[PDB]
Amino acid sequence: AMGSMERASLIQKAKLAEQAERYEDMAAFMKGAVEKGEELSCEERNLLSVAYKNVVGGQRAAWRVLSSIEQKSNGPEVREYREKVETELQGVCDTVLGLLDSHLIKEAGDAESRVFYLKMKGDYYRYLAEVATGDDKKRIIDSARSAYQEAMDISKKEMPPTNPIRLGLALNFSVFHYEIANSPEEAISLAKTTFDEAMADLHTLSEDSYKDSTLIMQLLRDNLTLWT
């Protein structure tokens, strides 16, 4: 679809789409850029993430509204429409996972890029898990856990405790534990140790990195305040 457009033009248009709040376009442009087969820069990885996070975020919010209405109802229309939204959401998740598997992850040698992509893999299996009920919920959950876990292992070995990707990964793995895996103590433990180890590393940072790191620490704090 985007095969005839230059990689640089796709990136340029992804940035324009972001400015215009056109996130479905943004995602299509970044999918096209990925499919050119070259590795993505830090900025380009963030564009990919922003685009699909916003697309799937709208779908998740809609699915939750419909699922709640469906539950309250204990005709077939509510179920049909929830299924329609669910199938669209699963399709987006499948597309992202397909990009990671073909071939972003295998070509990511650096810790920064490999952790970023493995976090994404965990996130999009997590979104699949939120709507899963069939013979594959358990396998979907374990796929999310495995991706998050490999990202955690690399990030702990290769990144400082205040690195924003490491922090955002730990935040989301903690949400996985609490919301998906029915492991609230694991969730609380991870959020707390991540928060404390970041705090102890802030003294090494510039004013700019300090702001970057403390922003995500605030989200860890917010969840601990919700959970304890």
Partner: peptide, 6 residues
């Protein structure tokens, strides 16, 4: 709902 990396 808890916060994930917005």
């Amino acid at each position: 709902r808890p916060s994930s990396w917005r």
